[PDB]
Every structure is written in structure tokens, then in C-alpha cells.
């Protein structure tokens, strides 16, 4: 299958409640580590990140944040102050899909303006929203200093393989849901709610629906997927039965199992 290595930054300079930089980062599903400006060292977010992973990963990850900080956040911080930009969201990801071809991007959702989709194979940044000196300003950060783009494209995929191997166990676990069906008290918006509750399932890929006489009821379909605490997933499907016999309704659920 495909596998993406994501690092999810949040830049909020002079924000009184938030720190300057948060980091996240997740092997697919699995959040694998976390850094922010107060902590002064990355912390891992899975046991197996803390055990099946070389130390030499963390000293160089540690350097990597500086790069984004020093080659990017510093250089535009003057700009954002001028535009009254309150915060910026930065997604840096590389993906290795069925080993056909490899994509590494870097995106920046400048708050208020759009996103800057920087493609790091072609080394060219496009505007996905409001156009501004930033789209090319970061193109030229990335065009010069090619050593830095050597941390965001090629080490990204080697680090993917590293962590992909450390996490192969985790990403392959199969938590099995429990499909539960409750009649929910008559709320303000549906008169007779029917909930199908599917909780603890690890492969996020899942196919569930409500059916009436086999026919798939899609009228009052409300569908939520919430995170659990142990890296599995929760799913709720609500329908207003509208005073139809509830014995005629069924919640068909296909999980990999």
C-alpha cells in the first residue's frame, strides 16, 4: 500500500496562549512524535518510536525542525507581522505509494491567504489561494540552498522507511469493533433517533451503513468518526426512524477483521 510521512506544524508568533511552533508528525494514522517551542527536545508519541527507533533519528530530526524554523519561519516572520498574519499551518509530507512513484510536498496555509503547495520534486511553489510575495519567496528559499531541500525530500523517504519498519507492527494491528445499536432519547432535531455505534477499530478503512429492507437509508444519515485514546477509531451513525418499525432497520458493517 501507500504510506505518507507527515509533519504538521503550527506557527503562531507572539500568540499569548500558544507557543511559537508545534510539530506533530505522523506515520500514516499514527502520531509518532511532537515538538513545540517550550519543550526544547522532541518527544515521541508511540512506545515503538521510543524503542524500535535509533537515537540517530532523533538528533537529526532535532536538526530538521531548526531548518524549517531557520530557513523559513524566520525569513517570513517579517512579512507575516506586516500582513497581520496571526498564525500559519505547515504540512510537510513525503509519500511512497505502492512504490510506483514518490511525492514529497510542503504546504503552508497562511491564515487568511490560501495555501502555498510547494512540490519538492520539481522544486516549484504554486499559489492555491491569494497570490503574494510569499509563494515565490519560498520557491527561492528552496531553489537556493539545495542542501536544505535534501532534508525535506530524500531524508524524508529514508526516515519513512526507518519509521515504517519500526511501526510496521503498530500500523498492522487489527482492533475489532463492537457494533452496538441504541435508540437515542427523542432529541430536538430527530423525533426517534437510531444510533449505530462502532467502537475500537484500528484500520481506519471501514464500510458501514444503515439499511431498511436491504435498501440503504440515506435520508437522515448523520455520520461521525472520532478518535479513541489508544490509536483506534470510533464511528457513530444516526438516523431518524420517523416512527417506522425499528426492527426493519439494520447496520451492516464491514471492517477488515
Amino acid at each position: 500500500g501507500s504510506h505518507t510521512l507527515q509533519y504538521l506544524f503550527i506557527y503562531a508568533p507572539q500568540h499569548p496562549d500558544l507557543p511559537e511552533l508545534s510539530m506533530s508528525g505522523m506515520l500514516d494514522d499514527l502520531q509518532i512524535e511532537y515538538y513545540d517551542s517550550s519543550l526544547k527536545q522532541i518527544q515521541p508519541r508511540q512506545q515503538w518510536m521510543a524503542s524500535k527507533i535509533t537515537e540517530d533519528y532523533w538528533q537529526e530530526q532535532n536538526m530538521a525542525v531548526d531548518a524549517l524554523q531557520n530557513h523559513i519561519f524566520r525569513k517570513i516572520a517579517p512579512l507575516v507581522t506586516i500582513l497581520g498574519i496571526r498564525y500559519i499551518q505547515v504540512l510537510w509530507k513525503c509519500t511512497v505509494e505502492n512504490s510506483q512513484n514518490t511525492t514529497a510536498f510542503v504546504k503552508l496555509n497562511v491564515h487568511g491567504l490560501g495555501v502555498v503547495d510547494c512540490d519538492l520534486f520539481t522544486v516549484r511553489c504554486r499559489g492555491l489561494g491569494v497570490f503574494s510575495v510569499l509563494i515565490g519567496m519560498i520557491e527561492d528559499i528552496l531553489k537556493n540552498d539545495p542542501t536544505f531541500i535534501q532534508l525535506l525530500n530524500p531524508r524524508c523517504v529514508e526516515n519513512l522507511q526507518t519509521v515504517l519498519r519500526a511501526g510496521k507492527t503498530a500500523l498492522e494491528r487489527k482492533v475489532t469493533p463492537q457494533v452496538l445499536v441504541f435508540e437515542r432519547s427523542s432529541t430536538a432535531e430527530m423525533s426517534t433517533p437510531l444510533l449505530c455505534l462502532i467502537t475500537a477499530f484500528y484500520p481506519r478503512t471501514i464500510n458501514a451503513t444503515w439499511l431498511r429492507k436491504g435498501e440503504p437509508v440515506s435520508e437522515d444519515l448523520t455520520v461521525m468518526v472520532l478518535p479513541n485514546h489508544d490509536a483506534t477509531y470510533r464511528m457513530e451513525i444516526l438516523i431518524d426512524i420517523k416512527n417506522n418499525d425499528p426492527s426493519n432497520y439494520y447496520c451492516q458493517v464491514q471492517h477488515c477483521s
Binding site: 500558544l18 502520531q31 511532537y34 498564525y87 499551518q89 496555509n109 452496538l180 485514546h229
Partner: protein, 93 residues
């Protein structure tokens, strides 16, 4: 209005006296500064653990504060969400 969607839920079905996890999750909130407070019986539950602020590919932010508790008969659990000056209180529900 950038206002959080918040759900308050339990990991597994409440079975009284049987350990569980109490979960308050907020997503879809525009100003990213948010407070999440787990409430037992109107009181703030200590030693609760929070995920880290982060977002989805669609840039929408996310927070999840949770804690291992044991549901007991009589007991009630909720979540104070303080977002953007306001506190709102969601009960298990």
C-alpha cells in the same frame, strides 16, 4: 462560526465499577486557542491527559483530552470547553 464541535463519550460501554476512559474531543474550531476541561460531578478531574493541538489535511484543528476513570452509580461526567472567551459544558449525552 469557527465554533468547536465537541463530543463527550466513553471508550467502551459504561459498566459500573469497571474501568473505562472518558473522552472529550473538539474539532473544527477557527481560533486555535482552546481549553478542554474534563468534569466529574461538576469538578475538574485531575491528571487528565491531552493530545497535542494539530489539524487534519483540511487544516481544521483538533484537540482531545481524556482520562481513565471508573464509572460509578450516581456519578456524572462532562466537559468544559473554553473557546474564544466562552465556556460551554457538554455532558456525556
Amino acid at each position: 462560526p469557527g465554533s468547536p464541535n465537541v463530543q463527550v463519550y466513553t471508550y467502551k460501554l459504561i459498566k459500573e465499577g469497571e474501568s473505562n476512559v472518558l473522552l472529550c474531543h473538539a474539532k473544527d474550531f477557527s481560533p486555535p486557542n482552546i481549553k478542554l476541561e474534563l468534569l466529574e460531578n461538576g469538578r475538574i478531574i485531575p491528571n487528565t491527559t491531552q493530545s497535542d493541538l494539530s489539524f487534519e489535511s483540511d487544516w481544521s484543528f483538533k484537540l482531545t483530552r481524556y482520562v481513565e476513570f471508573t464509572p460509578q452509580s450516581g456519578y456524572k461526567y462532562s466537559c468544559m470547553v473554553t473557546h474564544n472567551g466562552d465556556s460551554k459544558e457538554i455532558q456525556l449525552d
